[PDB]
């Protein structure tokens, strides 16, 4: 998954370029991480693993189909 960002404030760019150099990363890598970080923040719950647990707690079910 890739995405472009045009018309990015030239000041903002340097600020990010700086932050990346400060850490030992490339600018792209730094974007990836400042992004991935807030994303993990939005992740209040992981539906998949959540339902799975419920599955494992009961040894798994097999609901009837019910649907013409």
């Amino acid at each position: 998954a890739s995405v472009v960002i045009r018309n990015l404030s030239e000041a903002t760019h340097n600020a990010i370029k700086f932050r990346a150099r400060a850490a030992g990363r490339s600018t792209e890598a730094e974007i990836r991480l400042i992004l991935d970080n807030i994303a993990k923040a939005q992740q209040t719950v992981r539906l998949g693993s959540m339902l799975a647990s419920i599955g494992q707690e009961i040894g798994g079910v097999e609901l009837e189909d019910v649907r013409g």
């Binding site: 719950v45 539906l47 998949g48 693993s49 339902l51 599955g55 707690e57 009961i58 079910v61 609901l63």
Partner: protein, 143 residues
């Protein structure tokens, strides 16, 4: 936003739940996933039909005390407007070949209204409804 069809929400609860599907559900942000009242019905009935025992009592609890609450406010009713859409999604598909089962029409119709993407293993039907579909059983390629 995405609309989960019965069979996906069920996958994890099963014996050897398809890993690829569980992986995809985790790559999701709850507030983006919705359920159709129709689907909740199906789930709720699928539980009710189990032989009385311990398994059914627990599942029923987790079902109503854990799962569902997580979609509070994101459970879509089949209201009058949606009906109009349903009417077209089905008549259309028919006079084009692939006929759609009412149940599947309710879900499609619902999704369409809010231009949502239906996550289902049975995509073979929805695409005939001009609604975006995604099969988490399959791999992602996208161009």
């Amino acid at each position: 936003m995405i609309l989960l069809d019965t069979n996906v929400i069920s996958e994890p609860l099963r014996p050897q739940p398809n890993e690829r599907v569980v992986a995809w559900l985790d790559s999701l942000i709850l507030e983006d996933v919705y359920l159709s009242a129709i689907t909740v019905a199906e789930m709720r009935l699928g539980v009710a039909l189990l032989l009385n025992g311990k398994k059914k009592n627990v599942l029923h609890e987790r079902m109503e005390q854990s799962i569902l609450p997580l979609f509070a406010g994101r459970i879509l009713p089949f209201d009058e407007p949606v009906a109009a859409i349903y009417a077209q999604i089905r008549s259309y598909a028919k006079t084009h070949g692939k006929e759609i089962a009412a149940a599947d029409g309710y879900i499609a119709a619902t999704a369409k209204q809010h231009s949502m993407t239906v996550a289902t293993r049975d995509t073979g039907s929805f695409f005939a409804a001009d609604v975006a579909v995604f099969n988490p059983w399959h791999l992602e390629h996208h161009h």
